[PDB]
Amino acid sequence: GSEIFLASKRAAITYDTDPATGEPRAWLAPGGTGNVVAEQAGVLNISWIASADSEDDRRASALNPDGVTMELREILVRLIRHDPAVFRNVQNFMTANLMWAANNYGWDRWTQPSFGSDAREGWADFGRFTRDFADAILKSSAQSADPVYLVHDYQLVGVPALLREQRPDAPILLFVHIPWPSADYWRILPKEIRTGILHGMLPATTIGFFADRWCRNFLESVADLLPDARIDREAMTVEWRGHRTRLRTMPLGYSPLTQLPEGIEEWADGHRLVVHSGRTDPIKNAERAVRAFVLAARGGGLEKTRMLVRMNPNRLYVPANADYVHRVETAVAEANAELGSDTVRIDNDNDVNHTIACFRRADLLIFNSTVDGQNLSTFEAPLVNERDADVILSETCGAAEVLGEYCRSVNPFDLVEQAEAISAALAAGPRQRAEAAARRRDAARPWTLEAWVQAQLDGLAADHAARTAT
Amino acid sequence: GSEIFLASKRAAITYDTDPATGEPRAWLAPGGTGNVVAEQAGVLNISWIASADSEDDRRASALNPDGVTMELHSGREILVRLIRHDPAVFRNVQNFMTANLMWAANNYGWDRWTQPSFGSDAREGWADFGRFTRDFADAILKSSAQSADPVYLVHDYQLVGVPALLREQRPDAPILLFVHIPWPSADYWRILPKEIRTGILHGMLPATTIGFFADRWCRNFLESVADLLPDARIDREAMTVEWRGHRTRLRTMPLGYSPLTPQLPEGIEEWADGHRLVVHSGRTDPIKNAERAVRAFVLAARGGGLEKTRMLVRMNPNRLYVPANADYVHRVETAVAEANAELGSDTVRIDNDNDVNHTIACFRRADLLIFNSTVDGQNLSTFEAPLVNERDADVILSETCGAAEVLGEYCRSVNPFDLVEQAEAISAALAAGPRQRAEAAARRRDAARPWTLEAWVQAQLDGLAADHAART
Numbered sequence: 001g002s003e004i005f006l007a008s009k010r011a012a013i014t015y016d017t018d019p020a021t022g023e024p025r026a027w028l029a030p031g032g033t034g035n036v037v038a039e040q041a042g043v044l045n046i047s048w049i050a051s052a053d054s055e056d057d058r059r060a061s062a063l064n065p066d067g068v069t070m071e072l073r074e075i076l077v078r079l080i081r082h083d084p085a086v087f088r089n090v091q092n093f094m095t096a097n098l099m100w101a102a103n104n105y106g107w108d109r110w111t112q113p114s115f116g117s118d119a120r121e122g123w124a125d126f127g128r129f130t131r132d133f134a135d136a137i138l139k140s141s142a143q144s145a146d147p148v149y150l151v152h153d154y155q156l157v158g159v160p161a162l163l164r165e166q167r168p169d170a171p172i173l174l175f176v177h178i179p180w181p182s183a184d185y186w187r188i189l190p191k192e193i194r195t196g197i198l199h200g201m202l203p204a205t206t207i208g209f210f211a212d213r214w215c216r217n218f219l220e221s222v223a224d225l226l227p228d229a230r231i232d233r234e235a236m237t238v239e240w241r242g243h244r245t246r247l248r249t250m251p252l253g254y255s256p257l258t259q260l261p262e263g264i265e266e267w268a269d270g271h272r273l274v275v276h277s278g279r280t281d282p283i284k285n286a287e288r289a290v291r292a293f294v295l296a297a298r299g300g301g302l303e304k305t306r307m308l309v310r311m312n313p314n315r316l317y318v319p320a321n322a323d324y325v326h327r328v329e330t331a332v333a334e335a336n337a338e339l340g341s342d343t344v345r346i347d348n349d350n351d352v353n354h355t356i357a358c359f360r361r362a363d364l365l366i367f368n369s370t371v372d373g374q375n376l377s378t379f380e381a382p383l384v385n386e387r388d389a390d391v392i393l394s395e396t397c398g399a400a401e402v403l404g405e406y407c408r409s410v411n412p413f414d415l416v417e418q419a420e421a422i423s424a425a426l427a428a429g430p431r432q433r434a435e436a437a438a439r440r441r442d443a444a445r446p447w448t449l450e451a452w453v454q455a456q457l458d459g460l461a462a463d464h465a466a467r468t469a470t
Numbered sequence: 471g472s473e474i475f476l477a478s479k480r481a482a483i484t485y486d487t488d489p490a491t492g493e494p495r496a497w498l499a500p501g502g503t504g505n506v507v508a509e510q511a512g513v514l515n516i517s518w519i520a521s522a523d524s525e526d527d528r529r530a531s532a533l534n535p536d537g538v539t540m541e542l543h544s545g546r547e548i549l550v551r552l553i554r555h556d557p558a559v560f561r562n563v564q565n566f567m568t569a570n571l572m573w574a575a576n577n578y579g580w581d582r583w584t585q586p587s588f589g590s591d592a593r594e595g596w597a598d599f600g601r602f603t604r605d606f607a608d609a610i611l612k613s614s615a616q617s618a619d620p621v622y623l624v625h626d627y628q629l630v631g632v633p634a635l636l637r638e639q640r641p642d643a644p645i646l647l648f649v650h651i652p653w654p655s656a657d658y659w660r661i662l663p664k665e666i667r668t669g670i671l672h673g674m675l676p677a678t679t680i681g682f683f684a685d686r687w688c689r690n691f692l693e694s695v696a697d698l699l700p701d702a703r704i705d706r707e708a709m710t711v712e713w714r715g716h717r718t719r720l721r722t723m724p725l726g727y728s729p730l731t732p733q734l735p736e737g738i739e740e741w742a743d744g745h746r747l748v749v750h751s752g753r754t755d756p757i758k759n760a761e762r763a764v765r766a767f768v769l770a771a772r773g774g775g776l777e778k779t780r781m782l783v784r785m786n787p788n789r790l791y792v793p794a795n796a797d798y799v800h801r802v803e804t805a806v807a808e809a810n811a812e813l814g815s816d817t818v819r820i821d822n823d824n825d826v827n828h829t830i831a832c833f834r835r836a837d838l839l840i841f842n843s844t845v846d847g848q849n850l851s852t853f854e855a856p857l858v859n860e861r862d863a864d865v866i867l868s869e870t871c872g873a874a875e876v877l878g879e880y881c882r883s884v885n886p887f888d889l890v891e892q893a894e895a896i897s898a899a900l901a902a903g904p905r906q907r908a909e910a911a912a913r914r915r916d917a918a919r920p921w922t923l924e925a926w927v928q929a930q931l932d933g934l935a936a937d938h939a940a941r942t
């Protein structure tokens with residue numbers, strides 16, 4: 001019976017009042033990673049450590065600082081109250097202003113970025129935030145004789161080294177949900193950050209990414225920057241200062257637990273509907289999707305076709321995100337002016353059910369990200385689509401390593417190639433689409449949240465034996 | 471006695487009239503690669519094929535289509551054959567090869583999030599590029615038709631397509647392709663449209679030897695090959711590619727400077743007198759990073775100790791018609807204007823003119839040299855400047871110049887994107903005492919001195935000879 005300790009920046013919690021009693025209710029969101037882990041047979045018990053980012057979180061933390069047991073089987077939820085100034089700066093450190101641009105290829109080098117004092121301060125703040133997490137995690141696991149640590153996502157990259165210092169023999173997995181960039185791009189970052197982040201990650205027993213390309217890039221970055229590290233590209237390992245680290249690819253597609261926005265159905269009725277969906281993040285590439293649709297339309301055959309750009313607002317305070325929405329609006333305005341009024345609409349709202357409705361209704365799905373750690377939407381959409389919609393998928397999504405063969409895989413920067421794919425996908429007959437969609441669904445279906453959790457547990461257990469042995 | 475055939479986009483030629491007779495003169499520029507090659511002991515004779523890009527070049531080609539026997543000292547003659555491309559094709563290819571396309575691709579100018587977005591303009595550019603490549607191959611083969619065992623040396627990126635076409639006609643010839651600019655990471659290389667990112671690799675790989683100035687570029691190339699050609703096999707240790715029966719060797723052959731390498735630009739000396747002089751020099755190309763140099767200088771000044779210090783931004787105008795170059799000059803001007811407004815009038819000057827002698831004078835006069843490129847294929851300036859500097863100037867060198875693989879230890883190596891690190895290096899370099907600078911400069915000069923044009927040519931000939939045996 002392993003005692004599991006899960007850490008991630010955000011723990012999904014729902015705060016409300018009972019409709020009958022009016023009593024205040026805090027209750028964990030269904031299908032959460034912690035909930036799934038709670039279920040593997042091996043697991044005796046689990047605690048979950050995350051950041052308090054809301055007033056409610058804050059209150060709950062003060063209220064139960066050691067933590068609160070949450071019934072589901074039970075998982076102990078411990079929220080961290082960071083210093084507010086530090087927490088916010090770290091949030092800006094993790095945004096397209098810094099680390100998001102670094103792992104998601106947002107910088108052109110010729111003009112950006114130019115690191116100043118702000119970068120040094122952001123890094124200092126990042127160390128303090130990392131220390132909070134490590135301390136909360138260790139404290140939470142103090143009684144445990146054999147704690148298993150699962151650290152999730154980029155914000156926590158510094159945590160493994162600090163865990164390892166206090167717990168030299170613990171299984172530590174770090175899972176990164178976003179890409180890792182080429183060695184030349186990774187080293188854009190200031191010296192203390194580009195080496196310092198590698199110092200924090202490498203003491204993990206296992207580092208996981210969604211895609212092989214990300215493991216390869218990671219290993220090249222290590223090789224490039226730490227002259228004392230030894231990488232093995234075949235074995236996927238790093239040996240560094242007596243640290244042996246295993247890199248693993250553990251793809252995720254979707255959670256088995258997965259109506260239209262106002263006026264969309266009637267607006268779409270009588271037309272084929274091209275759907276592009278993603279957060280208001282420049283990587284999602286909706287501007288280029290729209291320009292590509294416009295080029296396809298010029299080719300003809302698209303007269304009864306409409307396009308919906310479905311966006312979920314996120315991080316709009318970040319200039320790059322705001323500017324992306326501005327570029328999307330511009331391209332959509334210009335598409336209408338040329339093609340005809342109301343050919344293209346944006347529907348920008350945070351309602352996951354609406355988006356799923358868009359997925360079902362689509363006659364063509366476009367997930368053409370400039371880059372993407374994985375992209376779960378491209379697994380969800382074909383699985384719920386009832387129209388035998390083709391999928392246009394960018395070759396730079398991690399998901400392309402699993403589904404690329406089953407989709408129209410495109411260079412997300414080539415408007416011509418993407419236009420041609422849109423024309424071909426729409427020209428394709430019902431029987432051909434129907435058969436391709438069934439192949440597509442079968443390729444997507446196995447990659448479930450649960451298999452992903454199992455992959456982590458097994459891969460960790462196995463890497464722990466190896467590390468223990470060498 | 472090997473018969474050598476050299477190809478490059480441009481062949482440095484001087485057109486003028488004899489000052490005594492008034493007769494028209496065309497003579498090869500001294501210190502040229504072709505001139506150097508002709509001097510090697512192995513070489514029996516050499517021809518040089520290049521593009522006509524001037525009206526003079528054009529008239530010369532029409533008058534001597536087969537070629538022209540240009541004269542060298544020591545009674546060594548190099549045959550020079552200029553190609554008259556179709557003008558429309560030639561100009562578009564110039565645009566393809568401009569930051570508008572291929573330059574941004576090998577020199578990391580694209581943010582991915584907003585640029586680039588390839589259109590029909592790229593497809594046409596590629597078609598034009600095939601036609602330009604076919605002209606070169608035809609001129610080169612024709613020029614070598616009589617030769618029993620022609621040795622082909624193909625220089626620079628514009629000719630990347632040439633080796634495959636040479637190999638088709640001449641399956642057993644030694645073919646070297648030397649690329650003078652960086653090769654980008656696999657993920658960045660594959661930004662380019664499918665027919666370009668694979669088609670360029672198809673063009674290069676049949677060469678016997680592919681050379682770059684730096685190991686990083688060879689590694690990136692190999693990763694690109696591995697990423698895009700599932701039928702290729704790479705060997706990172708051996709530095710080789712095997713692809714469709716083609717065995718290709720990658721080599722790093724660093725170049726520093728030509729031993730053949732004055733006075734300051736008007737008013738620079740008096741303006742600089744009484745002050746320590748920070749010098750940054752490069753073409754008006756965004757990779758040269760002068761904007762960031764200036765911002766870093768400003769941050770250094772805020773720290774104090776720089777009160778008697780001035781900065782000169784020496785630029786050589788080039789490709790100003792390309793928007794990214796014009797915009798770079800615009801960002802530089804802005805930063806220089808803002809530096810003056812904050813630090814004091816005339817603290818920083820730009821001197822932007824095409825006069826190599828002026829730049830060399832700037833190198834001699836500098837109390838601190840800054841070559842902080844965002845990326846560079848090599849950067850010869852960083853080798854030339856220390857070698858002529860009389861002031862024991864420190865050198866701030868970007869870790870992303872190919873030259874950093876030879877000189878990085880002997881310079882203040884910096885991340886070109888970190889204004890803070892670069893400001894600190896400027897303060898430290900200027901704070902350093904005369905004895906420390908003197909000793910560092912002598913070690914710097916010793917590290918730079920061996921990397922001559924001639925050694926580089928010899929490296930190509932030997933490396934090719936050796937790779938030809940292996941491939942054979």
Ligand SMILES: Nc1nc2c(ncn2[C@@H]2O[C@H](COP(=O)(O)OP(=O)(O)O)[C@@H](O)[C@H]2O)c(=O)[nH]1
Pocket residue numbers: 279311312349350351352353355356374375376377378380
């Ligand atoms: N909260 C919210 N989630 C959404 C909305 N639309 C889609 N989603 C989903 O959020 C996830 C998006 O993840 P993914 O495609 O991997 O891209 P990511 O945003 O970079 O992590 C998927 O599970 C989608 O179902 C929305 O409007 N609101």
Ligand SMILES: Nc1nc2c(ncn2[C@@H]2O[C@H](COP(=O)(O)OP(=O)(O)O)[C@@H](O)[C@H]2O)c(=O)[nH]1
Pocket residue numbers: 753785786823824825826827829830848849850851852854
């Ligand atoms: N024509 C010309 N050449 C210059 C001038 N200033 C410097 N140079 C030379 O041009 C070369 C610059 O090459 P390098 O630093 O390798 O950068 P590149 O411009 O990217 O190839 C050096 O040989 C310089 O000495 C100038 O004003 N005009």
Ligand SMILES: O=P(O)(O)OC[C@H]1C[C@H](N[C@H]2C=C(CO)[C@@H](O)[C@H](O)[C@H]2O)[C@H](O)[C@@H](O)[C@@H]1O
Pocket residue numbers: 153154177178314315372373374375376
């Ligand atoms: O909550 P935010 O506004 O900070 O951003 C939403 C998520 C985006 C990013 N999602 C990733 C996760 C996943 C799925 O786990 C991948 O499919 C995505 O490609 C990748 O962008 C990021 O990694 C997460 O930490 C963020 O919470």
Ligand SMILES: O=P(O)(O)OC[C@H]1C[C@H](N[C@H]2C=C(CO)[C@@H](O)[C@H](O)[C@H]2O)[C@H](O)[C@@H](O)[C@@H]1O
Pocket residue numbers: 626650651725788789846847848849850
């Ligand atoms: O075409 P131009 O003259 O506007 O550009 C000047 C040169 C810049 C570039 N010079 C390279 C040569 C060298 C040395 O030959 C490297 O040191 C530089 O880093 C690299 O930028 C390019 O490769 C050449 O083809 C160009 O002629």
Ligand SMILES: [Cl-]
Pocket residue numbers: 182184185654655658
């Ligand atoms: Cl890169």
Ligand SMILES: [Cl-]
Pocket residue numbers: 181182185655656657658
């Ligand atoms: Cl990259």
